[PDB]
Every structure is written in C-alpha cells, then in structure tokens.
Structure 1
Amino acid sequence: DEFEMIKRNTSEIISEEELREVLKKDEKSAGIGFEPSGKIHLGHYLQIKKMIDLQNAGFDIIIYLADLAAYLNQKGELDEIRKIGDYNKKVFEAMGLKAKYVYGSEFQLDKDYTLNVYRLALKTTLKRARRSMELIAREDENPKVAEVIYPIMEVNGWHYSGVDVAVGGMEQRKIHMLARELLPKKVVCIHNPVLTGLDGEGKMSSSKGNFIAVDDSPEEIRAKIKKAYCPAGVVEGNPIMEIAKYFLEYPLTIKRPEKFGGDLTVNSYEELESLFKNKELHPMDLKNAVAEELIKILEPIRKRLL
C-alpha cells in the first residue's frame, strides 16, 4: 500500500503513526531542501526517488533550493549559489520530478520571518544547534556564528512551508528533531539512508568527491565502480551493494562467463545479498552488473541534460 511504498528503503519514519494520520488527508504536502550542489549525485537521486514515491501517493511536493542555507553554510555568494540551484532544478526535473521549486531567500529574509528566526534563537541552545550541524556544517576550524543560525533558519523554513512531511538523509535528523520540538505543527520526518562513498571510507558527499553523479558518462560510471570498495562477502558499508539495493530493478540478471558460473538471475536484493554473502557472486560480476544497470537507469537523465 501507500505507506509501505513510502516506507520502502527509508532509514526511519518519525512516527509511522503520524504518517498514517497524514495519509488519511486528501491534501498533503511533502518538502525537502538541498543546498545547491555543483554535482547532483546518487545521494540526491535517492531522495528525489523518495519524493516521487510521495508524489505517487498523492502528496504535493515542494523542493527548496536552499540558497540562504548554502550561503550560511559557506558555499559562496547568493547569486552564484542561485545559478547552481537553477542547474539543480533542471537535474531534478530530468529525474522525472514535477514539483514546485522555491528559493528559500524568496521568503526567508522577510521581516516577520526574521523575527521568528530570533524567537527560535531564544528557544534553541547553542549546544543543541551545534550538535544539529555536526553532519551538515562545512568543515571549519573556527566555527562561525552562521553555523548556529543555519538550523533555526531551516526550522523556521519548515514552519513557513506548511508541509506535513519533511524529507532528508539521516544526517538531517537532528535539525528535524529541533523542528518537531520547537514548532506548533509537528512535521512527519522521513529519513533516507546515507550512502557510503565509493572508497568505502566515509559517507558519499559532494565535498568528498566519492560519489557517482547522475550525469557521469558511462565510461566514468564503469571506472568509478571498477575502483570501488567491494570486499567479497561483505555487505556492510559496501557502496556497490547499496547501489544494487537502492537503484536496481529486480528480477535482476547478472551476466557472467560460464566459467564463473554463467548468467545469474536474482529475484530480489535480499537474494542478491545472500548470494554475495555466501561468495557465490564475486565482486567483479557484481560490479559489472551494477555498472551496466546503473548506466541504463541514469541514461534518460544524462540524455535530458543537453
């Protein structure tokens, strides 16, 4: 059903009971925001895929091109940030998402909005605001006051958005917790898992250059996958298995030379995981299949961008 379709491949739903209450409503809205990113990667796509799930489930979708957040988070000047946000919109549209796109700065600098930001700054401890930014803040040896304005800026955004559901990666959870504690309307928070970087050494991120971009060329995708961390039998923190879990359609046919066991059809990610944990499926053949199927999945996106 819709709940299950929404829940599929999420890390958590802050409350399932509250989301069930939302799904009874006819008019319901879900939002996500992104600091504009020079490259749109599989992390982004995972969340937009989830936004599409909600859209299919009768939700109106709003995407915040979070230009002011990105400004607060040291991404550059607003005019430049906004150009990147416009590029990001194009990618999201190429992904098949029709939604309303709003630049946070269209409303986040209004006088009454600001006064509410100050109101929330009185209710939010520095310690809690800092903790909320631990996975989000730009690396800074000398953390700026802007870092603790960021979470109250976003919390007030959620308040102003009027959405019933907020979406983001697990790293967003502490900011979302603040929103649920501070605001008169508790937003349902759907968190998506954070993908491991291709080298398996941290989470996948724009600043770490450890991601596959939705517009990477086939040859780039093949090279990135060839080189990725993918230890035999190891599923945990294996970025290739995660791509297989989050992006691929099943039944999945894995091509292999007969000398390695010949073509392999797997009817679910859970079978794939079993075959991989049991070492019936070698990294090399997993990689080849994941690279080819991923290329196919991203191709219509790469094709539109042009």
Structure 2
Amino acid sequence: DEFEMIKRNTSEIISEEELREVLKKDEKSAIIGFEPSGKIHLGHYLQIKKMIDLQNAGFDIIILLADLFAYLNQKGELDEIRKIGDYNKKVFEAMGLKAKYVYGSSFMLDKDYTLNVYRLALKTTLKRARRSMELIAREDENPKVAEVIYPIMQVNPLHYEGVDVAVGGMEQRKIHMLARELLPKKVVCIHNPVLTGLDGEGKMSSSKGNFIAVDDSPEEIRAKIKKAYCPAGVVEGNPIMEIAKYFLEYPLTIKRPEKFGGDLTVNSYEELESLFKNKELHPMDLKNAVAEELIKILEPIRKRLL
C-alpha cells in the first residue's frame, strides 16, 4: 500500500490523515533540506531512501542544498559550502534519486524571503528558537545570534510554497513543530529515525567521525563494523542492528560456519531481531553479514562516485 510504504521505517508522520489527502492528488511534491556535508553517510542515505519511496509514490522531489543554513551553522564560508553542496548532489544522484536540486542562497537573500524572516522573528521567542536547535546547532560555548536565525529561516513559508510534504530527521522535529504552528498552509512532516553512531555513543554524524560513509572502501566498511558497538542480546542503540533494519533486503541469508550453526536464512528484520535478542545470532556473524550486504548495497554508489 502506498501510504504504508512511505510510512515504512519512519518515526512519525504529521499527520497521517493529511498525508492521505496528499496521496490522492495528481501532483504532489516532497522537500528535504541538507546542510552540505563533507561526507555523505548512512544517516543521509536513510533519508534519501525515504525520498526515493516518495518519488516511487509519484511525488516530485526537491532537495534543498541548505547552503546558507550551513553558513549560519558555522560550517564555513558560503562558496566553499556550495561546492560541498555540489558534491552532495553527485552523491545523491548516485543513490538513484530523481530530484530538482536548489541552493538556498539562490532565493534566500530575496527581499520577500528576508521580510518573512523578520516577520517570523517577531513571532518566535528566543527561548523556543534555541530549544528547536538543541540537536542541530554546532557546538558553541558562546552561542551566536546565527543560531536563532537558522530555525526561523527553516520555518519560512517560501521554502514550502506548493510543497505538500517535508521530510527530515527526528532531530528536526522542534523546528517542524514551530513551522506547524506558524506556516500559513500546513505541510506534512515525515520524520526519519536518527541512526546511532558506530560507537553506540550518540547519533551518527559528519562531525563526530562515527559513521559509515556511502563511499567508504569495503575494508574501511569492514573495519568500521568490526569495531562497532554491538553487544550480544542488545538491540536498542545497537547501530549494526539499525543498519540491518534500515538498509538490508529480506529474506536475509546470513552465512556462517556449520561450527556456529551454519547458514541462517532470516525472512524479516523482526525475525532477525528475535534471533539476535535471545542469542541464536552472535554479533560477529551479524556484523560479517551486515558488512557484506552493506558493501554490496553501497558499491554501485561508490562506483559511480569513482
């Protein structure tokens, strides 16, 4: 079912009724924004996969290369950000996304865009702006005014003109709660789960070096997964299990030595989850399988990038 495939592997949809209205329409578009990133990782990929779901469901897809956002979030200088953006677009194309790419700066410095920023800046408390940004804002001992401008730009109605659906990570939900209240026309939010970093420590992220990047070499993927936090029995906050859930194809045929049970054919992730949880599946065999299926999943993307 179409709704159910869009919903597969999301954390929430605001709201599912509105989404149902959206899907009946002949024409619908879904946006996502990304601060240009030095490395594109499985956190990026999960979300582009969701956009590919939407595209399969007939949506026109818009990718905002959120360059001014990144500028405000201290990712550096704008033309240098825009060249990272340009690379991100190649990466996204190599994932098989069919989309229109927009650079934020091409319209975000327009007079109407800027007046909406100041209009919204009158309606938005500093306390709320700062709360919305707690998971987004670059680490800063002395937070900058830039921090609170960022979420009000993110809620600006000009980003969403003729857009039915916005997709983002659950780390975006407080900014989206703001836009829910303050956008003149409602946009459905589709929020994706945040992937745990390989060390189990916090979330996967470009600046935390705890990610597998989609163009990692096979041995690099192998070594990254070997090291990964993956306690026997434990599923919650286990990033190897997360990768099995969000990226793998089922049925999944786990190769093992007969000394360790021999080949294991798992028909669903929930099946994999119980086998791992009661312990018929060791970390090391999950890892080899995850690493090997992840390598196969990534390799056309690495190939195109190389």
**2:256 maps to what in 1?**
256
CA RMSD between the two structures: 0.8
Q: For the residues of structure 1 that align with 2:47 and 2:157, how far apart are their CA atoms?
A: 19
CA contact (8 A) 2:12 2:190 kept: yes
User: Offset of 1:157 from its aligned partner?
Assistant: 5.6
CA deviations over 1:193-243 (Å, ceiling 9, x no partner):
000000001010001000000000000000000000000010000000000
Q: For the residues of structure 1 that align with 2:157 and 2:289, how far apart are their CA atoms?
A: 42
User: Offset of 1:287 from its aligned partner?
Assistant: 0.3
**1:289 maps to what in 2?**
289
CA deviations over 1:99-126 (Å, ceiling 9, x no partner):
0000011000001110111000001110
| Helix, strand or coil at the partner of 1:189 | strand
| Helix, strand or coil at the partner of 1:123 | coil
CA contact (8 A) 1:232 1:282 kept: yes
What TM-score does the superposition give when structure 1 sets the normalisation length?
Answer: 0.99
CA deviations over 1:30-60 (Å, ceiling 9, x no partner):
0000000000000000000000000000100
User: Offset of 1:18 from its aligned partner?
Assistant: 0.9
CA contact (8 A) 2:63 2:101 kept: yes
CA contact (8 A) 1:63 1:99 kept: yes
User: Offset of 1:159 from its aligned partner?
Assistant: 4.3
Q: For the residues of structure 1 that align with 2:31 and 2:298, how far apart are their CA atoms?
A: 23
User: Offset of 1:256 from its aligned partner?
Assistant: 0.5
Q: For the residues of structure 1 that align with 2:299 and 2:108, how far apart are their CA atoms?
A: 36
Residue segments in structure 1 that go unaligned for 5+ positions in a row: none
Q: For the residues of structure 1 that align with 2:40 and 2:246, how far apart are their CA atoms?
A: 16
Q: For the residues of structure 2 that align with 1:91 and 1:170, how far apart are their CA atoms?
A: 22
CA contact (8 A) 2:225 2:240 kept: yes
User: Offset of 1:303 from its aligned partner?
Assistant: 0.2
Residue segments in structure 2 that go unaligned for 5+ positions in a row: none
CA contact (8 A) 2:113 2:158 kept: no
User: Offset of 1:158 from its aligned partner?
Assistant: 5.6
| Helix, strand or coil at the partner of 1:143 | coil
| Helix, strand or coil at the partner of 2:276 | helix
Q: For the residues of structure 2 that align with 1:28 and 1:34, how far apart are their CA atoms?
A: 20
Q: For the residues of structure 2 that align with 1:146 and 1:44, how far apart are their CA atoms?
A: 24
Bigger Cα displacement from structure 2, 178-187 vs 36-45: 178-187
User: Offset of 1:161 from its aligned partner?
Assistant: 4.1
CA contact (8 A) 1:33 1:64 kept: yes
Task: Evaluate the alpha carbon distance shift between residue 220 and residue 161 of structure 1 in structure 2; reply closer, same or farther with a 3 A threshold.
Answer: farther
User: Offset of 1:154 from its aligned partner?
Assistant: 1.2
CA contact (8 A) 2:157 2:183 kept: no
Q: For the residues of structure 1 that align with 2:147 and 2:163, how far apart are their CA atoms?
A: 24
What TM-score does the superposition give when structure 2 sets the normalisation length?
Answer: 0.99
Task: Evaluate the alpha carbon distance shift between residue 160 and residue 235 of structure 1 in structure 2; reply closer, same or farther with a 3 A threshold.
Answer: closer
Q: For the residues of structure 1 that align with 2:34 and 2:81, how far apart are their CA atoms?
A: 11
CA contact (8 A) 1:159 1:185 kept: no
Extract structure 1 runs of 4+ deviating beyond 6 A: none
User: Offset of 1:162 from its aligned partner?
Assistant: 2.8
User: Offset of 1:98 from its aligned partner?
Assistant: 1.2
Is 1:206 the counterpart of 2:200 in the alignment? no
Task: Evaluate the alpha carbon distance shift between residue 159 and residue 183 of structure 1 in structure 2; reply closer, same or farther with a 3 A threshold.
Answer: farther
